[PDB]
Structure formats: C-alpha cells, structure tokens
Amino acid sequence: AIIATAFAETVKFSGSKQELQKRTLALYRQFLRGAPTFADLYEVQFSIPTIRTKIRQEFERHRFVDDLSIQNVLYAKGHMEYQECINFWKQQAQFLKYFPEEDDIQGRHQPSNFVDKFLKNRA
Amino acid sequence: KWPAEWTPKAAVR
Amino acid sequence: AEIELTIDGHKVSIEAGSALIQACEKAGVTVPRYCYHDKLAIAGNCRMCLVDVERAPKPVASCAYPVAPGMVVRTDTERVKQARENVMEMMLQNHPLDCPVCDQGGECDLQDQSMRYGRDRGRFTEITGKRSTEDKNIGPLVKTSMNRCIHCTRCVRFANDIAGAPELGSSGRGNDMQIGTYLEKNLNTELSGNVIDLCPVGALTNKPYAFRARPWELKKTESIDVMDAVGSNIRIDSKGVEVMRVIPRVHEDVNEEWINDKSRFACDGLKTQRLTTPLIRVGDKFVNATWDDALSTIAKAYQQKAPKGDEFKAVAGALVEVESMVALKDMTNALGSENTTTDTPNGNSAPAHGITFRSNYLFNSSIAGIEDADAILLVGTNPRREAAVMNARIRKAWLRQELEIASVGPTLDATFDVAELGNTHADLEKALSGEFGEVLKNAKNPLIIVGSGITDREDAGAFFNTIGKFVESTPSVLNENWNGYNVLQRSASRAGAYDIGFTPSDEASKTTPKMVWLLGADEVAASDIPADAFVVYQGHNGDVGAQFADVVLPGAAYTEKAGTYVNTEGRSQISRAATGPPGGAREDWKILRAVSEYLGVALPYEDAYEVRDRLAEISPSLVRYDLVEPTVFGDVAVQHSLVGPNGSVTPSSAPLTETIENFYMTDSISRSSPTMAKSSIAFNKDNKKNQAFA
Amino acid sequence: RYLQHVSDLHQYAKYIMAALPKYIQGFSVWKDELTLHVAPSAVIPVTTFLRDNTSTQYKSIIDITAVDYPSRENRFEVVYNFLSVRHNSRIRLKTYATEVTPVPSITCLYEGANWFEREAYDMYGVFFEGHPDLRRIMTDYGFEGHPLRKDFPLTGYTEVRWDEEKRRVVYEPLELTQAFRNFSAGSTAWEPVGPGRDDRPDSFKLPTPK
Amino acid sequence: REIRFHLCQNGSSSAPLRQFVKNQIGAFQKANPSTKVLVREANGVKPIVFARFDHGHESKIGLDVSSEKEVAERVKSLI
Amino acid sequence: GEHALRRYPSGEERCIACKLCEAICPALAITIDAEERIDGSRRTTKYDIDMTKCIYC
Amino acid sequence: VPAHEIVSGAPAELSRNRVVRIYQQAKPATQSGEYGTFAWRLDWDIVDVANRWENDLIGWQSSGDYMQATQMKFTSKESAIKFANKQGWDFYIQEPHHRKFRVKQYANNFVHSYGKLKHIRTK
Ligand code: SF4
Ligand code: SF4
Ligand code: SF4
Ligand code: FES
C-alpha cells in the first residue's frame, strides 16, 4: 500500500510538549469543524451543540496529564478516532457508544447513599 | 433398584 | 557444621548428618519419592529415590543415605533411569485399574510420576491376575479402599508418631500384608481426617461426601480457619457456589501442614441450615421479610423501647470478623452504651485479666517456642480438645526432647504423658509451692500455659493471683527475651476482640438491657437475655441463637468474606472470599453500617479501605498482617495483672470441670452439619470399637 | 549434514554480529532457526543490511508480530521474519517495546510490512513511528482495548444485543449464561521435561583452562 | 470512655512515651478509674494517643516529644 | 451426527461419571453433575450437552 | 510510575472498584511435587453480587464477573508489583510460607532410651 487513506497522517512522535499542544489544538479544531458532518452522517436524534460539548468534555478528561509520551499515545488514539468518524467506517451504533447517558433514562433507583447501594448490595 | 435455608422456629420469650 | 558436596555438577552446602534427599531438595534437583515426607520419620520402603553415588556398588536410597563430605551425586545416570523405570514397573502390576473412579484423578502422586519416569508399556497380562486384599471399615470420616494401597507405611508412621493413635498397623508378611486395624475397630484421634491428604494414592479418602468435582474443575482459594484458636491455614476448594473441601496450606510456625478434624469436615454445615433472607417474629412463628421491613422494624423498636444508655447489650460470639466487631463497637459507643460483652458464661464482666497490655491474654512465647520448651504445665485446659494442632506440637516436642508435663484440671487423656496434680486451686498452690518451684525455676525455657476455661469461672481472679505471683517471683519463666506466661483461647475472635477493647465496663454489668444484640453469639442461654428484650440476631446459619430472636439478619460466613482474624499468638491474617454469600446474605460489617443509618449514628466510613484505616486506628498490629512482635512490657504486664485480682475474690473449692462437653459439636457450624452429628455418636468411646482394649 | 549445517549457521551469525557491532546485541540459534537480538533504535540499519548485502539479502517480509511478557520492564518484544528467496534462508529479528514507547517502522523498506504492522498494533498496542495508516484492523471500530494482551480477559468487556427501545444494537457490559471454566488450574506439579542436551558445536563454546 | 496509645518497640521517638507507660499507669488508672486504658505496638509507628469521650467522638495528639513530664502534659491537655 | 449415551446389555447406563468427556471438549459443551449412591457405583445426576456449541470433533 | 490505566483501554471500574492479589501458589498437601510454586499469580478478589449464580433451566453456573478465570504468571514479586501499580490497581502481596529445615537421620528411628520407652516404632 503506497498511498494512504484520505485524512490520515504519518504517526510521528514529538520531542516537546508545546509542539504536542499545537497538534492537539489543531486536532480539536478538526473535530469541532467536522461536528456538523456527524449529525447528517450518523443520523443522530439530537443537536450539533451536544456533539460539540461532548468533544469538549472528552478533551476535559485528559487535561491534567503530565507525562509526554502518554500525551503522545493519547493524541495518536484521538487522531485514529477522528479518522474513523469523519468517514463512514464507524456505523451509527458505534457512534452512539459515545452518548450512553443521553439516549434513555433506565428507570428509578439510581443509588446515591450507602443504604440505596446496600438494598441491592452495590448493584 | 439404584444452601437450604433455616426453617423458622421462634422459641418462647 | 556444614558440608559442601556435588549433586548434578551443582555444588551445595548443607548441615552435617542430614539426608541426601534434603541436599537434593536444596540444590533444586528433582528426585522422585513415595514414602518420604518432610514431617515424618524416614523409611526406605518405596524404593523410588535410588541415586548414583560415586564410591557405592549399588544405587542407594537417597532418603536414608546420610550426607558425607566430598560426595559426588549423579541423578541422570542411565542406571538410575533404568532403576526408576524398574521400580515404577514393579509398583504398577497389581495396582487396580481405578483412575476413572478413583478420587485422586488429577492429584495422584503415583500417576504424575509414572509419566516423568514410568515405563510406557505394561507386561502384566497374566491369567490369574490381580491381588484383591478386600477392605475394612475404619470410621465415618475416612473412606477406605485398600486395593489401591502401595504400602508406603506413611499412614501408620503418622498415626504412631504425631497423632498419637497407635491403632493402625501393618499385619502380614509378603503379598498378604495389610495396613490398618484388623479388629474392625474405630480409628479415633482428634486430628484424624488428615491421613487422607497424606496417603499418596487414593486408598484413604473422604467418607462424609463422595467426591463430586474432579480437581481440575476446582477453584483454589487461600483462607484462614476461624473454627479454632490457632487460626490454621486452610485451602478452600470451590466449584463456584458450593464449597467442596479444605486442605492445610503449609505454615512454618502455626500448624506445620496439619489441620484439625473439626476444621476439615465442617464444610458440611456451610451449606445446610443457613440464613438466606431476613425474618421477623410475628408471635410463636417467624415470617420472612423485605430487607427494609426488618431494618425499619429495628429502628421502630429502638424508638419504642428507647434505651438511653447502658441498656443496649451487644454480645458477639465465636467465629466473627475483626471488622464486624469494630462496626458493632462503634455503633454501640456512638449509640451511648458500652454494654459490649462476649458470649462466654461470666462474660458480663471484665475477664479478670487486663485488656491492657496485650501480653495478658495472648500466647506470649511463640507457637514455634514450644519446640524449645523444657518443662511446661497446663492449668484448666485440655489441649487435645481445645487447639488440637497444639497437641501435635506438644507431642512432637516431648518425643524429640526431654520434657516434663504436669496438669491441673480434669483427668485428661492426652497423647503424651502428663503428671496429675489435682482438681482444686488449693491443689494448684500446693503444686506450685511444693516441687515445681524447683522444676520451673531450674528449666531453661519453660512456659506456664493456661486455658480460657478458667476465665469461665467466677472465681477466676484468685486463680490468676497465684500464677501471676509465681511468674513475678520466678525469673526463669519471665525475663528479657521470652515471656512464658501463656494462655489459650477457644475462638478466632476472643483473642482479637480484646485487641479492640471489646469488653463491658463495671457499670455495664449491673443493668438489665432492653435491646440485646446477638452477633454470632451461639451459646447464649434462655436466662441470659430478659423476657421483654429486643433480641436481634446477626449470623450465617440457624441455631439456638437465632431461635430467641425477633429479627434475624443473614450474614456471610468466613468463606464468603475477606476478613481479618487474630489467633492466640497474635498473628493478624486475612481470609480470601471464595464464593458469594448465598441467596440474600450480606457482609457482616455492612449490615451494621446500614442499620446505623436508620438510627442516629453516621459511621464515618463506607469503603473497605476506610475500614482498614479505622482498624489501624484501633491498633496498627492488625493492618500489619502475619508478623509476630515481642513485648517489652511483659514484666510490667504480669505485675499489672497481679495487682487487680488481689483480694477481690476468694478461691472456692469448685472442682475443675471440662471446658467443652464435646469437641465435635460447637461454634454454630458443627451443630448444623450431619458429618459432626454422626461423628459425635460414632466416637463416644462407649462402644468397643473406640477403646484400645476389650 | 544437519550437524554440519547448524554449526555453519552459528558461524554465519557470528560474522553478522562482527560486521555490525554497534547494533546487534545477541544471537541465538535453536535447530536451523536464527534469531537476531536488536535494540529498538537499531531496527532500520539492521533491516537495510539484511535487505541490501549480497551475502545477506532477505528482500521479503513474511510475517511480523509481538509477544508480551508482562514480567519484564520492556513489555512487548517485536519479532520480524524474513526469507532470502535467493539463498533459501530464513532469519528472525527481535526487538523490544514498552506499551508507551515505540519501535520504528520498516514500511519504508518493505512494502508488504505496513499491513502486518497495523495488525500487530491492534493486537498489542505496539507503535510504529513513521507509518502512514496506523490505525486498527480486524477488530471492532469502537473497540476499547487490545485483545492479545494478558490483562485483557477471554470474553472481553462488552457484548452486543438488539435493544427494542432505541431500535438499534447496544453495547453492554459482559454477562454470560455459562461462565468460562479454565482447566489450566490442574496442571502438573512435577517438572515435565528435563533440561536437555545442547547442539552447540565444539568451536563456539568457551574453552576450559588447561 | 476510653484512652488508647501506640508505640513502636524500637528505641527511637517512642522511648519517653515507653518510659511513661512503664511507670505512670498505676497512677493513671487510679486517677481515672471509670475509663479503660489499652496500650499497643506495631514495630514501627508514630507514637500517638487516642481518647474517646461521651459520644464516640474521639480526639488525637501526636507524641513526638522528649521527656516523660512533657508526655504527661500532652495527655493532661488532651483530657 | 447427534450424540447418544449408550447402555449395557441387561440394561445399565454405562456412564460412570468419570469426567473425561468434559475435560477434553474444545468448545466446553459438556456439563456434568456427578453424585454417588449408597451402592458405591458412580453415575451422573445431570448430563448435558449444549448443541449450539458442540463442534463435532 | 506512569499511570497506564488510561491507555490500556480498560474501563475505570476495573481500576477504581476491584482489589487484586499477588500470591505465590502454595505447595499442594495432596501430592509432593513443587513445580507450580515458583511463579507469582496475579488474581482478582471476587465481587459480592456478580460472582456466580445458578441458572433456572439447567443449573449452569452463570457469572457476571469477567475477570473470574483470568490469572497471570510473573517471574518475580518485583515485576508483579511494578506491573500491578503501573496499571493502577490495588494489590495485596501475600508473602510465601516455606518449610523449616530440620536435620533428619534414619538412625533417629532407633536410639537407646534410658528411661520409659514412651513410644514404639513400627516401620
Ligand atoms: S490412586 Fe492409583 S488407581 Fe487411583 S487414580 Fe491414582 S494411580 Fe490410578
Ligand atoms: S494406607 Fe495409604 S498412606 Fe498408608 S501405606 Fe497404604 S497407601 Fe500409603
Ligand atoms: S462421564 Fe463422560 S467421559 Fe466419563 S464415562 Fe461418561 S461419557 Fe465417558
Ligand atoms: S522415599 Fe527414599 S526410598 Fe522410600
């Protein structure tokens, strides 16, 4: 395989943290710009701002990561996920892995205190 | 030719 | 003192005079064997460990050939491989074709070893066929199929040497040799279901259950036994909801690969009469209930009775976790009542020896220290019954060295040889003044050893006075490096409850409680609780203790929870949960943690790591596991334990009774198991089969 | 023949180490199989030497993979397999790579290699720096985890079923109707094989003095 | 109500508290008869007194201090 | 093709609860519960093959 | 210690709910071999409700815990503990219990007892 696929980039490992910060910056710009495509493409029920606030809160999850090479693998995994999402490779049931809390409320009795955990012995 | 639960007994007070 | 030699080109250094099989074990060389064992005598029956030795005409038995210097040992000689094929082939000619129906399927020593060294083919195809040697009854605990025996003498070496039951034997010459009693009499020893994990073939196995699960199906789990005070190491084998067996994991100090009979065959009571739901008493009959129903019934009756203080009795029992006792004690003391007592009769007071200074109630010389003992005396105990592995330690010491025993209490039948002294505290004081102020003073490493059946007695303190005054007077029993005042316990919890401070106050012994808590607590009497009391039980199976209750709460037994337990020596040890609590039982401390929420008490923890940290706060030798520390305060503790009961109580002439009327039926599991229920009446020593004579 | 030939292979590999002392850490032979023990920053020059020399022209990547031993600090070892179709010879090349650090990719040299590299990527999470189209292959697209890795269980974390409500398949944590029962617990407690003899020629083991 | 404290059996940082419990316990039990004391050790800890009052509410203080009388001062300020 | 548990002549079940067919099955289709009667002979309380997952080896 | 629980793709609950255990396997009391007592086993403590339960149709031992049949083998305790805290798990190292050396002689089986025999060997 000589030529690559469409949105791919050669996986290459930066030696500094600021260059990685620039790359994750451009990456969030790519997700956020392609967010109107995903609602048309995967036929979701909901609004484009919920896609955008999810992309934001999935980069909130790894804001305080110190180690450089763990940021490096995290960037490579994020670019692979962008690559799958911007094409039609993922389907609409694996795109909705990302939104389990939105689609339906499962029922009563979400346990909060120790008693509600304990009546069904920590579920 | 070829965890049983305990039966309830309440004694006297 | 050591000897350097050569095995398999390796060089190895071992202490002089040892066996060559120990040098082969030390160097890492695998040598096959059938009649050698680390804890037994040496016999050369089995003929497997033949080994090539330079300056020897024949291959010598490596288990009984002693270590000499300049020794050149080869194990991979073609003569040795021929020898092992030869001996294996000899072993396998009238051994019967029983591996589809044998117990030791994947655990047979003979079978695994007929692969690494055995011949491929078998020539025994004679017409007249196999020897038969039809079997014989032994007892209700040991299944006996003597066709599969290979006569390794290991069972009878054990029952002679360590178990102290010399009934087993070898009767015959040549092919008509049999192993076992041939009166058709009953093998009784208090550690008797131990010969079946010792026999390398499946001749002596489990009688109370047929094996239902082959050992490749089993899931092994490494836990602690809590039935006895030694806290011996077991190995729980489970198919996944049920528990199949327990087997002694080896420990260097506490049990040395030997396990109790009651320890072993009381997995039957773990699955027959349990509690799988909470119950509420309606009046002469329980009904089962919603969890919330029972746990709101408890809060409603707390609001109705309203014990303001010193009226919430909280008695624990025999086999209970340290963490459940911490949860209970925290709930009572944030409730406002330290009526916080133990299950034994005369438990309502402080136990006449200090919760202070842990060396008051522990086994202070180590369990390993009995091997170093010189002349010891027991008071108020039968170590054959209470802590039966301890008797194997006593008899091992008394047989290896020169020891002197005397005893104060009921006339016991030990394996070993006691001297009688009397049945009275006056006989005690006469014996400590008369001739053993020479013996215990003369001895290098004695120890004085005490049952917990005297803490039972209401006249306990006068019995502590004489013994503590003697230990304070005599400097050989009590000095710098080892302490020799020693007590026994009978439970896994009563040696760990006193670590917490689980004891009632002098004010707490005076009132009558309105709301009684039973946690385990199986040997309570009908007179020990009041008639109007709110009597809620928390246990794992139905018992006498659950019969009095208004609410029962199903708890997890020792198999189903990862719990901390403290023995008499003071070792903190964790168990591993092998299976879940069945039906609707829960863990023991979490039930108290939730009943606290329905009361006004918010217990500060909700996680098991926070339980571990709170448990460190009570005493940090309980988050440090399986370490034994010495005490620098033993000298101070003997005096502080002497001063208290001086003149507080008069020694009456009540004779020294037996502490337990039966070994096989106690501690709330052995009462439920039918294995114990038939093993108590089969070993009553009324019948002619248990007795040695007539 | 075969004794002579394995003694010849020993000498060939001794030469290969002596020609490149900066890059080759070890070599081991076991029964007409040659393994070259190479650092991870040492991959590309050794592979060019294996492609390019006339004594050493392997030309053709067959299969590459990783293997994890979790008991080592550098977790995965990445093994390469080559075939000189001229000289009728096979050669093997092992490097190492932790979960987080890379190994560089030989897809600049070997054109078939890239598909192999992303296969070993998905099965093991081992990185190939310098590789166009590094992403997953032969697993699920939204699959979280690396399967051929010792912390990952047998049946995995998730399972698939059709929810009627959402009118789509949903991904759920694992529930079995029959639990997996491994029978590995119940292996032999005696050592099953001996140490075994050696096939080292007399010329390549160290002399005893005198 | 209770009071408990903990030492290490090493001869460093716990020796004054050790000398306090070697001597002053026969007077401390008489000065507070209704409470219960309990002393424990775990081969290395920091020396520390825990005492529990009329609620289950307990208080703590850390006894890294040089002499016996200072240990008595920390306990007296604790009660 | 489809499985069958044989019998002896003069009528006897012939499965002696020896547990080998469960330990070998490359798809874990066998599930056997074994219990022993008073007689000393061995049989199976519950024998079971899942034929969704038997693979016919 | 680099925190690798965010890169291995394991869910959070496997790092923040379950406790795991280092142990060397003990020597079996049944048979006298010692081969399986050298490697260090990493194995998960069971969970309360999701261990195992009986099925209603046949009686199949259905489980809900998914690490019930996984074990690992390590060479040393240090490799096991570095792997255990690198993946971000809460361990418990269980220290092994060996046998005590004691000199054996076959000549122990008979000595001249000067007093009571107190024992009769049989062999
Ligand atoms: S004990 Fe003997 S008959 Fe039974 S399985 Fe083992 S080798 Fe076979
Ligand atoms: S009864 Fe068992 S242990 Fe005793 S000699 Fe026979 S086979 Fe060996
Ligand atoms: S249980 Fe299975 S392996 Fe055993 S005899 Fe019956 S059919 Fe054969
Ligand atoms: S074990 Fe050495 S010959 Fe019996």
Coordinates of C-alpha atoms and ligand atoms in Angstrom, one line a residue, chain C residues 92 95-111 148 150 200-203, ligand 1:
Chain C
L92 CA 2.2 -51.0 38.8
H95 CA -2.4 -51.8 41.4
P96 CA -6.0 -51.8 40.2
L97 CA -7.5 -50.0 37.2
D98 CA -9.4 -47.4 39.1
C99 CA -8.5 -44.0 37.7
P100 CA -11.9 -43.3 36.2
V101 CA -13.4 -44.0 39.6
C102 CA -10.5 -43.1 41.9
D103 CA -10.6 -39.9 44.0
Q104 CA -7.1 -38.8 43.1
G105 CA -7.7 -38.2 39.4
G106 CA -5.5 -35.2 38.7
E107 CA -3.9 -35.2 42.2
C108 CA -2.4 -38.7 42.2
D109 CA 1.3 -38.7 43.1
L110 CA 1.8 -42.2 41.6
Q111 CA 0.1 -41.2 38.4
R148 CA -5.2 -49.2 45.7
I150 CA 1.1 -49.4 47.7
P200 CA -0.1 -40.6 48.0
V201 CA -2.7 -42.8 46.3
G202 CA -6.4 -42.8 46.7
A203 CA -6.7 -45.6 49.3
Ligands
SF4_1 S1 -4.5 -43.6 43.2 FE1 -3.9 -45.3 41.7 S2 -5.8 -46.1 40.8 FE2 -6.3 -44.1 41.8 S3 -6.1 -42.6 40.1 FE3 -4.1 -42.7 41.2 S4 -2.8 -44.2 40.1 FE4 -5.0 -44.5 39.5

